[PDB]
Structure formats: C-alpha cells, structure tokens
Enzyme design. Sequence first.
Site, PDB file in Angstrom:
ATOM      1  N   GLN A 158       0.786  -1.181  -0.031  1.00 23.85           N
ATOM      2  CA  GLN A 158      -0.205   0.113   0.051  1.00 23.85           C
ATOM      3  C   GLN A 158       0.935   1.162  -0.014  1.00 23.85           C
ATOM      4  OE1 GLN A 158      -2.468   1.766   3.301  1.00 23.85           O
ATOM      5  NE2 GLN A 158      -4.037   1.323   1.889  1.00 23.85           N
ATOM      6  N   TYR A 191      -5.935  10.915   3.472  1.00 23.79           N
ATOM      7  CA  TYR A 191      -4.560  11.265   3.263  1.00 23.79           C
ATOM      8  C   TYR A 191      -4.329  11.946   1.832  1.00 23.79           C
ATOM      9  CZ  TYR A 191      -3.817   8.240   7.306  1.00 23.79           C
ATOM     10  OH  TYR A 191      -3.935   7.603   8.611  1.00 23.79           O
ATOM     11  N   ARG A 222      -7.362   2.029  -3.208  1.00 26.37           N
ATOM     12  CA  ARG A 222      -8.203   2.162  -2.093  1.00 26.37           C
ATOM     13  C   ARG A 222      -8.945   3.491  -1.759  1.00 26.37           C
ATOM     14  NH1 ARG A 222      -7.870   0.017   4.246  1.00 26.37           N
ATOM     15  NH2 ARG A 222      -9.575  -1.605   3.882  1.00 26.37           N
ATOM     16  N   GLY A 240      -9.702  -6.698   8.905  1.00 25.21           N
ATOM     17  CA  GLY A 240      -8.785  -5.795   9.464  1.00 25.21           C
ATOM     18  C   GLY A 240      -8.435  -6.200  10.719  1.00 25.21           C
ATOM     19  N   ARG A 241      -9.271  -5.746  11.883  1.00 23.96           N
ATOM     20  CA  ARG A 241      -8.948  -6.116  13.270  1.00 23.96           C
ATOM     21  C   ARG A 241      -8.905  -7.393  13.448  1.00 23.96           C
ATOM     22  NH1 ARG A 241     -12.995  -1.528  14.824  1.00 23.96           N
ATOM     23  NH2 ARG A 241     -13.489  -1.778  12.752  1.00 23.96           N
TER      24      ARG A 241
HETATM   25  C1  LIG Z   1      -4.660  -0.942  13.462  1.00 28.84           C
HETATM   26  C2  LIG Z   1      -5.344  -0.285  12.158  1.00 28.84           C
HETATM   27  C3  LIG Z   1      -4.167   0.165  11.187  1.00 28.84           C
HETATM   28  C4  LIG Z   1      -4.914   0.338   9.840  1.00 28.84           C
HETATM   29  N1  LIG Z   1      -4.215   0.777   9.135  1.00 28.84           N
HETATM   30  C5  LIG Z   1      -4.478   1.173   7.660  1.00 28.84           C
HETATM   31  C6  LIG Z   1      -3.632   1.320   6.714  1.00 28.84           C
HETATM   32  O1  LIG Z   1      -2.354   1.429   6.940  1.00 28.84           O
HETATM   33  N2  LIG Z   1      -4.156   1.785   5.620  1.00 28.84           N
HETATM   34  C7  LIG Z   1      -5.532   1.548   5.372  1.00 28.84           C
HETATM   35  O2  LIG Z   1      -5.796   1.769   3.895  1.00 28.84           O
HETATM   36  N3  LIG Z   1      -6.391   1.296   6.367  1.00 28.84           N
HETATM   37  C8  LIG Z   1      -5.795   0.751   7.461  1.00 28.84           C
HETATM   38  N4  LIG Z   1      -6.847   0.639   8.407  1.00 28.84           N
HETATM   39  C9  LIG Z   1      -7.982   0.317   8.108  1.00 28.84           C
HETATM   40  C10 LIG Z   1      -8.087  -1.327   7.985  1.00 28.84           C
HETATM   41  O3  LIG Z   1      -7.661  -1.774   6.540  1.00 28.84           O
HETATM   42  C11 LIG Z   1      -9.668  -1.600   7.707  1.00 28.84           C
HETATM   43  O4  LIG Z   1     -10.280  -1.148   6.414  1.00 28.84           O
HETATM   44  C12 LIG Z   1     -10.556  -1.048   9.090  1.00 28.84           C
HETATM   45  O5  LIG Z   1      -9.844  -1.684  10.117  1.00 28.84           O
HETATM   46  C13 LIG Z   1     -12.100  -1.700   8.818  1.00 28.84           C
HETATM   47  O6  LIG Z   1     -11.999  -3.154   8.708  1.00 28.84           O
HETATM   48  P1  LIG Z   1     -12.150  -4.122  10.129  1.00 28.84           P
HETATM   49  O7  LIG Z   1     -13.416  -3.726  10.675  1.00 28.84           O
HETATM   50  O8  LIG Z   1     -12.298  -5.789   9.556  1.00 28.84           O
HETATM   51  O9  LIG Z   1     -11.113  -4.126  10.959  1.00 28.84           O
HETATM   52  C14 LIG Z   1      -6.232   0.093   9.654  1.00 28.84           C
HETATM   53  C15 LIG Z   1      -7.160  -0.395  10.667  1.00 28.84           C
HETATM   54  C16 LIG Z   1      -6.555  -0.548  11.757  1.00 28.84           C
HETATM   55  C17 LIG Z   1      -7.401  -1.146  13.105  1.00 28.84           C
HETATM   56  O1  LIG Z   2      -5.915   4.566   6.613  1.00 28.38           O
HETATM   57  C1  LIG Z   2      -5.340   4.211   7.812  1.00 28.38           C
HETATM   58  C2  LIG Z   2      -3.947   4.390   8.153  1.00 28.38           C
HETATM   59  C3  LIG Z   2      -3.305   3.940   9.356  1.00 28.38           C
HETATM   60  C4  LIG Z   2      -4.396   3.831  10.380  1.00 28.38           C
HETATM   61 CL1  LIG Z   2      -3.752   3.452  11.947  1.00 28.38          CL
HETATM   62  C5  LIG Z   2      -5.740   3.587   9.923  1.00 28.38           C
HETATM   63  C6  LIG Z   2      -6.031   4.022   8.940  1.00 28.38           C
END
Ligand SMILES: Cc1cc2nc3c(=O)[nH]c(=O)nc-3n(C[C@H](O)[C@H](O)[C@H](O)COP(=O)(O)O)c2cc1C
Ligand SMILES: Oc1ccc(Cl)cc1
Length: 364
Positions: A99, A185, A232, A321-322
């Site tokens: 990414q 961003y 994305r 994600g989580r």
């Molecule tokens: C700790 C954490 C870090 C994340 N980092 C990114 C990131 O680097 N880039 C991004 O596009 N989304 C990031 N996200 C968003 C996740 O990719 C995901 O879209 C979001 O957590 C919702 O999905 P979920 O409910 O299954 O966790 C992050 C989410 C969390 C919780």
């Molecule tokens: O798009 C993003 C990037 C970093 C984090 Cl922690 C959450 C969402």
Amino acid sequence: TQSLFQPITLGALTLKNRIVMPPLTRSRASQPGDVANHMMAIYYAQRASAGLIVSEGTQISPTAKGYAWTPGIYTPEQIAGWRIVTEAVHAKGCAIFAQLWHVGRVTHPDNIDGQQPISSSTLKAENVKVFVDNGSDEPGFVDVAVPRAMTKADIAQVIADYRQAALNAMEAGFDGIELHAANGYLINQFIDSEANNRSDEYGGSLENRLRFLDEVVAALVDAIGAERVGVRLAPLTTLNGTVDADPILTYTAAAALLNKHRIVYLHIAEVDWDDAPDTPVSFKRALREAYQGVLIYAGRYNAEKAEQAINDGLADMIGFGRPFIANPDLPERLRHGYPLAEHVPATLFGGGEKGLTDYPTYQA
Ligand SMILES: Cc1cc2nc3c(=O)[nH]c(=O)nc-3n(C[C@H](O)[C@H](O)[C@H](O)COP(=O)(O)O)c2cc1C
Ligand SMILES: Oc1ccc(Cl)cc1
Ligand SMILES: Oc1ccc(Cl)cc1
Ligand SMILES: Oc1ccc(Cl)cc1
C-alpha cells in the site's frame, strides 16, 4: 462461507480464496531507517492463508510519512526489508500488494525531516493528531501542522515518487501495489470537496478533484502494469477529516475513472474504528457497475456478511482488518466458525513482537 472460500483471479494471480488482509499500520518498522523487518516478515507470513495481503501503508518518500515507525519503501534498505517480507509470504503461497502511502497534510514536520506538510490546499486537518518520536521529546500524539498547497512541480514530484515507489515495490517482490487514496490522506485531500479549495485544474469541479488521482494512477499503471495496481477509497468514512459534499457521486465517478485505467482491483474501506456510516446497497450496486474489476470491501465484516456481500454480487473479495490482527489463521476460523480472539488496542502500534506475532493459531 462457500463463496468466500472460492479462489479468484487477480490479474496474473490465482488467489486461494476471497479473504483479504487489508492494510494495517502496526508501526513496527526498525529504527532508524523505517525499515520493514524480521518480526514484520513473520507477522505477515503468519497470515498468509489470506487470499491476498495488502501491506500496511508504506510511505513513498521522506515527506510522505505521517506516523512514527511506519515502514518506508524508497530506500534500498527499505526495499530489502520488504523483500524478506514478500519472500516469507510467498513461501506460504499467498499474494501481497504494497500500500503506497502519502499522508499529505496528516503529519507533523518532525515526521517529515522538518518540512512543512503538503496538501491540495492550505487547510489543516482539524482536531487530527499524528504520533511523533523525534528523539528529544517523549514520543506521543501531536496536532498535525498546517500544510502548504502543492504547486504543479510538487504534483509532478509526488507522482514521480509514487511511480518510483511502485517500481520499488516490484523490486521488493510485491505482486502489486495499492494506492492509498483513502482515510483523508494526500489523494483524499484532492478528491473530497471540503478539503480542496484549489482554483487550478486540480480543484473545483468533480473532474478536477479527481485529476490528481487520475494522473497518479496513470503513472502507476505505466510503471508496473494495470494488472498490478489496486486503489483504495473510503467514500463515506471521514478518518482524518476530509469531507466531500456529494460522496456517493464523487466516488461512483472515481470508480468509473479508475475503471478506465483497468486497475486490477478497487478496495472500498467501509468502516474506520467506530466510524461506520450506512453504506447504501444502491451505492454499492453503482460501484459494481462503475468499476468492473475485482471489488474488495472491508469494514466490520464477519463470515456471514462477507459471504452475503459476495453472493449478492456486491463484492468479489472481503477484507478483515482487526480480526486478522488477533487471528493469524482467520480464514480457518471463519470457515469452521471457530471463536475469534480479539486484539489488544494497546499493542496495535509500536513495540515489538508482543501483540504482533504472538497471537496463537486456534487450538481447541
Ligand atoms: C490498527 C489499524 C491500522 C490500520 N492501518 C491502515 C492502513 O495502513 N491503511 C489503510 O488503508 N487502512 C488501515 N486500516 C483500516 C483497515 O484496513 C480496515 O479497513 C478497517 O480496520 C475496517 O476493517 P475491520 O472492521 O475488519 O477492522 C487500519 C485499521 C486498524 C485497526
Ligand atoms: O488509513 C489508515 C492508516 C493508518 C491507520 Cl492506523 C488507520 C487507517
Ligand atoms: O505510528 C504510530 C501510531 C500510533 C502510535 Cl500509538 C504509535 C506510533
Ligand atoms: O532478489 C531477492 C533478494 C532476496 C531474496 Cl530472499 C529473494 C530475491
């Protein structure tokens, strides 16, 4: 879960299932140098039963970084570090995209070599904080700085950095790249109307607001091929404070624009933490028509909702994600209905292997 465990073609790749490990910033990059490292390689390899892994955001340049300890993808050391990660993952039989990240105004000079953040405009992300570890003050969250509006030269340079970052990703052995155009961003700061007050060809009209996205993607595709470029978007969440006046229209258009580039997948972030806006099915249906490649959604999906999204014809793949943080064998748990461990927020970012590689696989 039957469809969820059907393979899917992603460009030149034949993925094992429809499960994506979406980008998850863990801020574990080695210091100094912000280098992807051994624990990260282990961490990603542990989760390589995913059909596709998308790396945490990785900054394309020194001034693209927003948060302490996130891995870069522009130095030789950073490329080598990522290479060990991709090899570790590939050893398991899995695809991995990098990414490519530029945070734009969502940063602090301390994170970007004392420079001023850049953005479409001179608008600060209100009430938004990033994390800083400048070596002097105690590491912690600080308010983002006010950005300066990108010049035509800045735009050319950042596009160049994105293009090179894509080549660097291929050199690091990634199968592709995901353009981070979401969560407020840099690119999101052009797309969303309330974050873009430009008067030149990169602001105002919908077409203008999408121009930077258009040109960045053109470059990425030119560099490594459309079959290795994903993007994305986060149409309705407002993480880091970019707001659009007509997001449903803006992002359906964006999907159509990206479709013209034939990007291999479009990845829609539906939820950010507790920011979980109703995403109308009609909107999802429009995206499905606007963009005819592989459509990925992430945001509070479980096995049932993931399967239904696929069977409803709305999604081709679903990111978790989580749950992937706390369940390295998430796919196996989803398939069997094994209970999911929950992640510890306290170890999401920074630190070491604890809360990263020591979540066990399921054991009855
Ligand atoms: C700790 C954490 C870090 C994340 N980092 C990114 C990131 O680097 N880039 C991004 O596009 N989304 C990031 N996200 C968003 C996740 O990719 C995901 O879209 C979001 O957590 C919702 O999905 P979920 O409910 O299954 O966790 C992050 C989410 C969390 C919780
Ligand atoms: O798009 C993003 C990037 C970093 C984090 Cl922690 C959450 C969402
Ligand atoms: O890069 C980051 C992000 C969040 C935290 Cl708590 C620490 C470092
Ligand atoms: O080009 C490279 C470099 C390192 C490894 Cl493990 C594989 C391929």
